[PDB]
Each structure stands twice: as C-alpha cells, then as structure tokens.
Design a binder for this molecule. Structure first.
Ligand SMILES: Cc1c(-c2c(-c3ccc(F)o3)sc3ncnc(O[C@H](Cc4ccccc4OCc4ccnn4C)C(=O)O)c23)ccc(OCCN2CCN(C)CC2)c1Cl
Ligand SMILES: OC[C@H]1O[C@H](O[C@H]2[C@H](O)[C@@H](O)[C@@H](O)O[C@@H]2CO)[C@H](O)[C@@H](O)[C@@H]1O
Ligand SMILES: [Cl-]
Length: 514
C-alpha cells in the first residue's frame, strides 16, 4: 500500500512542519529520496485507522502518550538504535517511548504548558488561580480580560484538574485506580466552570480564539506550549513565560508530552526513516531547523538541549514539567482523553453538572478494564468449571453483580441457542493459536455489523464463553485471555458512547435485574 523509495511524514499543524520539510529537503540532497511532510487534521485519530490496513505515513509524530495504543495494535516497527545513538538523547526521553520493554519511537522534545502573560498589561502575573476573578474584574474596566486558553482540548485544563488530587492512573501505572471523579478533580473543574459562569472565560473559547486574543493584546494571559512562542514573537507582544498558578496552594500539574517519531510497521522504507530520524532530524542542525519554525521545548538531544537550556522560556517550561507528571503511554490513554474532553466541554457549556460529567468520565476511563475483568472471568470459569478466587478491586460490587447477572443470562443464551453455537463452532476450524486470531477477526465483523442493545452484547460474550469451553477441551487454555481481550476490545471500541449512556455495567445489572 505504502509506496517504496519515498518518506511520507505526519506531524501536527501547531508544530514546525516547514522546518521539518527543510530537513526533508537536505535528506533528498544526499539520497535522492523525496520527503513529503503532511499535517492532516485529527492525525492521532486517522493514524491508527489507516495503519491497521497497512496504509498511512512512514513516520508519525505525536506526543508519546498515544504510541502504546499504536504499539498494542502492532502499528509500529520496533526501533533499534545502537548505544552510541541512545547516549546522544536523555535516558528519561527514551523511557517515555518504551512499551513492553521495546523502544517504539524516537523521542524529539519535552513539552509542558506554561502560563504566558503580557508584561505591558500584567507586570507581575498571578501566583494563584484564586486571584484571577479579581484580576479579570480589574482588567475588564480597562477593556481587557485576564485569561483565555483553549477549553476544547482537556490537555489545557488538566493542570488545574490535577492540582488538588486529580489523576488519570495512580503510579508502574495502576489501570484499576482512576482519579478522574475524586474531590480534587471536582474542585479543579468546579473552579473552571465558576470562571465561565461568572463571565471571566467563555465555554466556546478554542485554540484559535485564545491565540488571536493574546497576540492582539486583548487578554493578559494564555496557557500554551513552546510551539506557540513563534506567533507571539511575530505579534511584538512583550510576553513572559512563567510557572502556572497554584490551586488551593497546590501547584498546577500539567501532563508532560515527549514529541516522538514512530515508524509505521507497514512501511517498505524503515531503513530510510531510521536514517532520516537518527542522522538528519536528531542532530544540532536538524532540530535547529524545526525549532526556528516552531519551538520544540526541551529537546531530547543533549548536545542541542545544552544550548537552549539557557533560555528562561525553556527554564519555565522545565519548571512546569517538574511540578507535573510525564504522561502514561498505556493503550487506555486514548479512552481517558476522550472521556475527559467530553466532561470538560459539557461542564463548561452547562449541558451536564461537574458531578454528572466527571462520573461519565470515570465510567469511560475505567470501562475497558471493568469490561475485561467481567468478560475474561466469565470465560475462564465457564471453561474450567471453577470461579476465580481473586478479588475484583475498585468498583468490585459492579464487577461481582455484572458477573452474577452474566452467569444467569449467559448460561440461558448458551443453553437455548446451543444448536447454532455448535453449528457455527463446527463451521470454523479452531485447532491452534493462529485459528483463534482468525475467530477474533470474524466476531469483530459480525458484532460491529448489527444494532446495539444488551441482548447482542450478552450474545457476543456468551459465544466467547462457548468457544472458551471448546478451547479448554483441545488443550488451548492459553488462547482464552486473548479471546477475552478481543471481545472486550470490539465491545468498548465500537459501543463506548452507548455503554457510558447506560451507566456501563450498572445499567447491565439493572436491565437484566429480576
Ligand atoms: C454466534 C452467532 C452470531 C454472532 C457472532 C458470531 C458468529 C461467528 C462468530 F465468530 O461470532 S458474534 C455475535 N455478537 C452478537 N450477536 C450475535 O448474534 C446475534 C443473533 C444470534 C445468533 C446466533 C445465536 C443467538 C443469537 O441471538 C442473539 C440474541 C439473543 C438475545 N438477544 N439477541 C439479540 C445477532 O447478531 O443479533 C453474534 C451470529 C449469527 C449466528 O448464527 C447464524 C446462523 N448460522 C447458520 C449456519 N450455521 C452453521 C451457523 C449459524 C451465530 Cl451462531
Ligand atoms: O487534549 C488531549 C490531548 O492532549 C495531548 O495533545 C497535545 C499534544 O501533546 C501537544 O503536542 C499539543 O499538540 O497539544 C495537544 C493538545 O491539543 C495528548 O498528547 C493527546 O493524546 C490528547 O488527545
Ligand atoms: Cl455555565
């Protein structure tokens, strides 16, 4: 699918893509390979869809948080630099692109949100979120506003949500302990909604609108990354880059990104991508090219980071980096952000309350692990005759009642529909691991191509139980957890919005409740 003798690169449109294309041109110089840089809308969403069919770009650039998802789905080549090259980048930048002990990308640069302020409007920027309503009242009398930043991407609101005890996954990383709807997070997002309610911010404010307002000198402050600094430089606003305000005395905790370059597993040009990234981009000359288009932040390349470390804007970036936490790269990061995006937009717009909205985000962020636990437990106890002794952990009442419900309703389906199950199981030839990976592909297709309701969800999980019974029978128990993950995966990928609407597994318990 991907053309050979070429490199197609995706990078996000807020980055220095003209600069990366200049590195592209210098690679063409030496090698006669053309390099196309593109910056599609929603490339973090489009990359996994197209790569899954052996398509998309050779190289994708994104923050490291998405790359584990991509790696889990087998969409990235293992990268294998020598020690000599590894030692040119900071050990911690490598750690951000390590998934199941394999390097899955080249780290490029460390990114944290800072408070950006207009020195001519605000000589001393505020130290606390609490003083911003006063400062806004004061600035409005002079025809200005205190603060405008992008309220459409949860990334920009995360530092306030994290400040007083909000977290995605507790720290390796425990995917059973999600802190999206705890007191700390409610307080953070409540402060934001109050700012909006009291007219100190507008729910509809996005990246464009905030950027234009700061750069015309209408607002005294914005929250943004190093990529933003080029446009402000050009607007001749006298700006400073500082530490974010505290909330309830606690520092703002930004989620730190490492801009990372992955190589599509479907690429016929992997050697070229490695050569480009290792010997063209990740050089003093290579990164300088890009950094002049749009600043990268604290670059991963020690040699060039020593140069830029002297910049007080980088020093403030690093200061904000250390008050915050480096993002997880676990596959569930994608579901976490989709849930928290939706919570922030609906709290901001008043379509839900803070409590309603963060509850729905807690369900969304937990949904995959909650679903896997129930489904894999049902499959294993169906196959073996014996229930799993281990405790269900957090939200363990929901898992226990869902499993107990599924036992009654799933046994009923398997009993009544045994004919078609034996029939469909015989029509397929389950004999080995490779046959199991095939069966997954079919279920995904059959489930996906039909209406959403609890009966069809029980039927998918009940057929899985049926198949798990058989897999045990042919000494193939090892393939039962992969089968559970496949059923879990399609269920929460394709029916996420419906499951959150039904209050997830509590709705399942309620719907089939005697
Ligand atoms: C299990 C199944 C599904 C089927 C899946 C399947 C097929 C093959 C693989 F790998 O997954 S995944 C899946 N996920 C959800 N629903 C499925 O099937 C149902 C319909 C259905 C289906 C079967 C049993 C109970 C069934 O009852 C569904 C039911 C019970 C209560 N409410 N509902 C909607 C739905 O999609 O609505 C299915 C789909 C079709 C099926 O049979 C069609 C007839 N066929 C004739 C030839 N013979 C040799 C084999 C059987 C069967 Cl047996
Ligand atoms: O809004 C959630 C979003 O946050 C991060 O994306 C950042 C990115 O890291 C930055 O490089 C810059 O481009 O801004 C983006 C936010 O608009 C996560 O990396 C991303 O996965 C997530 O969707
Ligand atoms: Cl409101």
């Amino acid at each position: 699918k991907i053309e050979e003798g070429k490199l197609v690169i995706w990078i996000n449109g807020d980055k220095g893509y003209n600069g990366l294309a200049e590195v592209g041109k210098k690679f063409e110089k030496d090698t006669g390979i053309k390099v196309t840089v593109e910056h599609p809308d929603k490339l973090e969403e489009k990359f996994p869809q197209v790569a899954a069919t052996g398509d998309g770009p050779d190289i994708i650039f994104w923050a490291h948080d998405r790359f584990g998802g991509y790696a889990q789905s087998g969409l990235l080549a293992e990268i294998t630099p020598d020690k000599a090259f590894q030692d040119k980048l900071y050990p911690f930048t490598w750690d951000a692109v390590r998934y199941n002990g394999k390097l899955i990308a080249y780290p490029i640069a460390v990114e944290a949100l800072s408070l950006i302020y207009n020195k001519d409007l605000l000589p001393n920027p505020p130290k606390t979120w609490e003083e911003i309503p006063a400062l806004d009242k004061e600035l409005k009398a002079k025809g200005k506003s205190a603060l405008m930043f992008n309220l459409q991407e949860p990334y920009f609101t995360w530092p306030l949500i994290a400040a007083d005890g909000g977290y995605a996954f507790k720290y390796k990383y425990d995917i059973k302990d999600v802190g999206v709807d705890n007191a700390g997070a409610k307080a953070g997002l409540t402060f934001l909604v109050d700012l909006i309610k009291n007219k100190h911010m507008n729910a509809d404010t996005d990246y464009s609108i905030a950027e234009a307002a700061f750069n015309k000198g209408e607002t005294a402050m914005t929250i943004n990354g190093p990529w933003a600094w080029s446009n402000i430089d050009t607007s001749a606003v006298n700006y400073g880059v500082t530490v974010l305000p505290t909330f309830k005395g606690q520092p703002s905790k930004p989620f730190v990104g490492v801009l990372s370059a992955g190589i599509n597993a479907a690429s016929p040009n992997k050697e070229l991508a490695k050569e480009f990234l290792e010997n063209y981009l990740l050089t003093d000359e290579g990164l300088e090219a890009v950094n002049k288009d749009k600043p990268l932040g604290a670059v991963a390349l020690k040699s060039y980071e020593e140069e830029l470390a002297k910049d007080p804007r980088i020093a403030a970036t690093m200061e904000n980096a250390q008050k915050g936490e480096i993002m997880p790269n676990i596959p569930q990061m994608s579901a976490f952000w989709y849930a928290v995006r939706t919570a922030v937009i609906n709290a901001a717009s008043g379509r839900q309350t803070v409590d309603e909205a963060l509850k729905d985000a807690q369900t969304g962020s937990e949904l995959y692990r909650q679903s896997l636990e129930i489904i894999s437990r049902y499959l294993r106890e169906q196959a073996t005759g014996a229930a799993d002794t281990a405790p269900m952990g957090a939200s363990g009442a929901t898992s226990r009642k869902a499993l107990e419900t599924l036992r009654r309703v799933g046994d009923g389906v398997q009993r009544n529909h045994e004919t078609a199950f034996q029939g469909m199981l015989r029509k397929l030839d389950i004999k080995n691991e490779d046959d199991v990976k095939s069966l997954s592909r079919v279920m995904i297709h059959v489930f996906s191509d039909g209406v959403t309701n609890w009966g069809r969800i029980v039927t998918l999980i009940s057929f899985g139980a049926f198949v798990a019974k058989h897999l045990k029978t042919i000494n193939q128990e090892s393939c039962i957890e992969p089968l559970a993950e496949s059923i879990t995966d399609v269920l929460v990928r394709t029916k996420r919005d419906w499951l959150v609407k039904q209050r997830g597994w509590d709705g399942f318990v309620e719907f089939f409740h005697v």
